[PDB]
C-alpha cells in the first residue's frame, strides 16, 4: 500500500544516516595514529543491502572496514614507532568521503520527496467518502 | 499525463549521459595514447498520427578526436610515439588484434615486447614480437625496425630482428572497443601494415583531450538539463490545475 | 475562407524586422486567405 512507501522510504532515511555518521567518523580519524582498543582505526564503510523479504526495504547489514593498506610514515622518534621507525596511519581517503558525503545527502533528500508524494495520495484517498 | 513530462525527462536523462561521456575525457587527460570521445545529440521524430510536434533527442558518439596528442620526451629507448597519423597493432588478453597508440613499450622476462597495458605488439610476421633473452642494447628504428645487440657483442653487431606493425587506416572506419582498442567497424577485415607511418623514438604520446572544449560543453549541458527540468515541473503544474473539471 | 491564423506565442509578438515567421504564414494573419 501507500503506507509501505513510508516504511521503505523511512528505511532509506535511516540507511543514509548510518553512512553519513560512518563518513563523519572517517573524516575525524584520518590523522589519528593512536586509538583505544589497540587497533589503528581503518576506514569504515556502510554496505547497504536490499532485504527482499513490490516493496523492497534497504537495510544496513553491518559496517565493513577498508581493505587498503595503512599509510606507513617514517617517524623514528615517536613512542609508537616500531624497530624500523615507521608509524602507521588510517587509510582514510578524503576524496571518497567527500563523494560519499554528497551522495548520502542527495539520496537522503530524494527519499523525502517520495514520502511527501505518498502522503498527498493518502490524503486524497481519504477525501473520497466525504 | 501530458507526454511532455516524458519528452522532457528523456532529454534530461540523455543530457546526463553526455555529461558522463565528457567526464570520462577529463578523467583521462593524462592517459597515454588516449583519443577523446566526441558527443552530440540526434533528433528522432515520433512519426505517427497527429500533428508532428513530438521529437526526441538522444546522445551518441559520432566519432573520436584523432588529432596528434601531446608528445612527452622521456629519453627512454622503449618509448615511441606515432608521428602524424597511424596506429600500433596489439592483441589483448583475448588474442584479438586491435589498434593502439600507447607506445610505452617494455620487455618481460621471456623477452616478448609488450606495452604498458600488457598487450603484445605485433610485427612483420603478424605474430607477437619476441626478442632474444640476454640483450645488451635495444634501439627502435624510426620506421619501426627493431635492432638489438647480443650480450657482450661488439658495437658492429646491430642486427635487426623485427619491424613494428604500423597501420594507418581511415579514421572514420575505426571504433573504440570495450577495452580502448580501435578496431574496424566491419568485422574480419585485415589490418594492412603501412610503411609510411613513422615513430618518434624517445617520446611518449599523451592524450588529445581539449580541456576547454569539455568545460564549455559541460556548462551548456547543465543549462539545457535545467531548462528541461522546468518543463517537467510545468507539465505537472498544468495537470494539477486541469483536475477541477471533474471536481463537481 | 475568411479565416485568420498564424503562429502564436513569443514568435509572433516581435517586430517584423526579425523575419522569424515564414512569409506564407505572415500573410495568413491578415485575413485575405
Amino acid at each position: 500500500s501507500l503506507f509501505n512507501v513510508f516504511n521503505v522510504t523511512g528505511s532509506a532515511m535511516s540507511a543514509e544516516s548510518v553512512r553519513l555518521n560512518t563518513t563523519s567518523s572517517n573524516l575525524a580519524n584520518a590523522d589519528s595514529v593512536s586509538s583505544s582498543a589497540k587497533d589503528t582505526y581503518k576506514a569504515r564503510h556502510a554496505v547497504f543491502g536490499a532485504e527482499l523479504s513490490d516493496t523492497v526495504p534497504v537495510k544496513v547489514m553491518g559496517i565493513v572496514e577498508s581493505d587498503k593498506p595503512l599509510s606507513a610514515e617514517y617517524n623514528p622518534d615517536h613512542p609508537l614507532a616500531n624497530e624500523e621507525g615507521y608509524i602507521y596511519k588510517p587509510n582514510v581517503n578524503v576524496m571518497e568521503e567527500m563523494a560519499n558525503m554528497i551522495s548520502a545527502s542527495r539520496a537522503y533528500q530524494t527519499n523525502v520527496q517520495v514520502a511527501d508524494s505518498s502522503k498527498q495520495m493518502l490524503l486524497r484517498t481519504l477525501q473520497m467518502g466525504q | 499525463m501530458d507526454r511532455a513530462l516524458f519528452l522532457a525527462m528523456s532529454g534530461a536523462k540523455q543530457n546526463m549521459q553526455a555529461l558522463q561521456l565528457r567526464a570520462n575525457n577529463l578523467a583521462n587527460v593524462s592517459t597515454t595514447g588516449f583519443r577523446a570521445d566526441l558527443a552530440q545529440a540526434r533528433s528522432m521524430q515520433a512519426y505517427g498520427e497527429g500533428h508532428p510536434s513530438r521529437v526526441f533527442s538522444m546522445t551518441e558518439r559520432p566519432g573520436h578526436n584523432f588529432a596528434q596528442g601531446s608528445v612527452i620526451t622521456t629519453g627512454r629507448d622503449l618509448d615511441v610515439t606515432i608521428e602524424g597519423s597511424g596506429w600500433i597493432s596489439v592483441l589483448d588478453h583475448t588474442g584479438k588484434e586491435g589498434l593502439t597508440r600507447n607506445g610505452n613499450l617494455k620487455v618481460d622476462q621471456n623477452g616478448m615486447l609488450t606495452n604498458a597495458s600488457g598487450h603484445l605488439v605485433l610485427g612483420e610476421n603478424d605474430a607477437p614480437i619476441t626478442l632474444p633473452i640476454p640483450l645488451s642494447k635495444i634501439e627502435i628504428g624510426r620506421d619501426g625496425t627493431i635492432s638489438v645487440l647480443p650480450q657482450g657483442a661488439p658495437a658492429e653487431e646491430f642486427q635487426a630482428v623485427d619491424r613494428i606493425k604500423l597501420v594507418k587506416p581511415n579514421d572514420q572506419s575505426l571504433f573504440k572497443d570495450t577495452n580502448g582498442l580501435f578496431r574496424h567497424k566491419t568485422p574480419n577485415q585485415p589490418y594492412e601494415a603501412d610503411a609510411t607511418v613513422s615513430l618518434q623514438t624517445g617520446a611518449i604520446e599523451g592524450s588529445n583531450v581539449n580541456a576547454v572544449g569539455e568545460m564549455t560543453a559541460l556548462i551548456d549541458l547543465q543549462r539545457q538539463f535545467e531548462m528541461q527540468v522546468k518543463m517537467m515541473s510545468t507539465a505537472e503544474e498544468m495537470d494539477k490545475s486541469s483536475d477541477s473539471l471533474l471536481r463537481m | 475562407g475568411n479565416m485568420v491564423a498564424g503562429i502564436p506565442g513569443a514568435l509572433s509578438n516581435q517586430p517584423p524586422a526579425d523575419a522569424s515567421i515564414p512569409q506564407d504564414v505572415a500573410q495568413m494573419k491578415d485575413g485575405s486567405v
Binding site: 500500500s1 501507500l2 503506507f3 484517498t125 481519504l126 473520497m128 467518502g129 | - | -
Partner: protein
C-alpha cells in the same frame, strides 16, 4: 471487515479498497432505504381507500 482490517493495522489492505468498499455499502443501503419507504408509502396509501 475491510474497515476493521485496515483500522487494526494490517498491511495487506489498501485505503483505496476500503474507501471503495464503504462507498458501495453506503450506496447499497441507501437503495434499501428508498425501496422500504416506497413500500410503506404504498401500504399507507392502500389502507386509505374506500372499501
Amino acid at each position: 471487515d475491510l474497515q476493521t482490517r485496515f483500522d487494526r493495522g494490517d498491511a495487506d489492505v489498501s485505503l483505496s479498497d476500503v474507501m471503495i468498499a464503504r462507498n458501495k455499502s453506503s450506496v447499497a443501503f441507501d437503495a434499501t432505504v428508498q425501496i422500504r419507504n416506497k413500500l410503506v408509502e404504498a401500504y399507507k396509501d392502500l389502507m386509505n381507500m374506500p372499501v
